[PDB]
Amino acid sequence: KKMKAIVEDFLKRLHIFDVAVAPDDQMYRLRDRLRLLPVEVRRLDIFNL
C-alpha cells in the first residue's frame, strides 16, 4: 500500500495546506516520524477487538 495517500488525507483534512505543493518525500518522513507515538487507548482497544 502506497502510504502517501493517508498522509495526503491528513494534510488536506487539516484545512490549511494544499497538497499540490508539499512533495511525497516529506510525507514519508512525516510517516516515519509519526510511527513512534503510541496510539490513543480507545482506538487501540478497537483495533484489538
Binding site: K1, K2, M3, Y28
Partner: protein, 49 residues
Amino acid sequence: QFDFRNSMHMLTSNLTFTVYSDLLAFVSADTVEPINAVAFDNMRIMNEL
C-alpha cells in the same frame, strides 16, 4: 594415372537435423510485479512504504 580402386571412398555424416543458433526462443522469463522485488539479503528492493 586415373586409378579407380583408390579414388573410390565412402563418406560419413549424420542422417538429418536442424540448425539452431538463437538459443533464446526456448526460454521464457516473466518478471514479478514491480512493487515486490527483493535484493540479495531477501529484503525488498525499495523499503520506504
